[PDB]
Amino acid sequence: GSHMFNMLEQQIIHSQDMAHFRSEFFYVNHEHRENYEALLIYYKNSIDNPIVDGACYILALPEIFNSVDVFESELPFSWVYDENGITETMKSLSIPLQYLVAAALEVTDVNIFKPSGFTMGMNNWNIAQMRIFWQYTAIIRKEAL
Amino acid sequence: GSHMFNMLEQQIIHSQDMAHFRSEFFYVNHEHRENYEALLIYYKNSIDNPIVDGACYILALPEIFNSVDVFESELPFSWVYDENGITETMKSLSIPLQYLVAAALEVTDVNIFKPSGFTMGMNNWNIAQMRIFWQYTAIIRKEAL
């Protein structure tokens, strides 16, 4: 068909290939994976901005996804802090998950804790939490050569 | 895929036996490996601290190792800064390596750059540098359960 048709077919094929790639990632469980795919659809800037993609991967964690209205905020981590510091929603999350969220914000040069989420995480995270962190960082740096 | 991250989890799970499988770690080349093994002996009286072990792993990188006067560096990162700020040796290193050293220092809540080593690395590191970073983190968190 036409050139637009060729371009559309390739976008479709590419997105199928990316879905296959994501299927091999670490997830804490199948819910985490389902949540992630749902958030990627919701936050359309994820398809081109690795930082948004990574954020979806974290927000998809069932402890976050099920305790936080992730579909109400225009920006992925808008619910985390305001002018008065971290919000009650953020405070309600487990401490190690707070560190993960803070480390994700640190990728964007937004430092919500001192010591930083990265610092605290590197002195405290268990194996599961390390697997999440590693997977998150691999998404963020997907463009690495 | 997930192969390196599976390998790093196995290292942590079995870290009480880590002295026997260091040869299996990710290294950039054989020189990185031999430098690390040597540094672990040189700093042997403090390597029971995972932070010191991880610091040796970074210091072992040939571009760093071959710039550092190891005999004048009390601990593996003493050479990085003094009362006057970051040293000439530190400034002389490629920028992405400076980020790795800074990120490692951030694990001990020593923060020499703004934006942080972790932040800059997460926006810049190539594949080899990500792998160094990941292998470093597995050493640091060898006690994770």
Automatic annotation (TrEMBL), chains A, B:
Pfam families: DUF2538. It comes from Staphylococcus aureus. This is Uncharacterized protein.
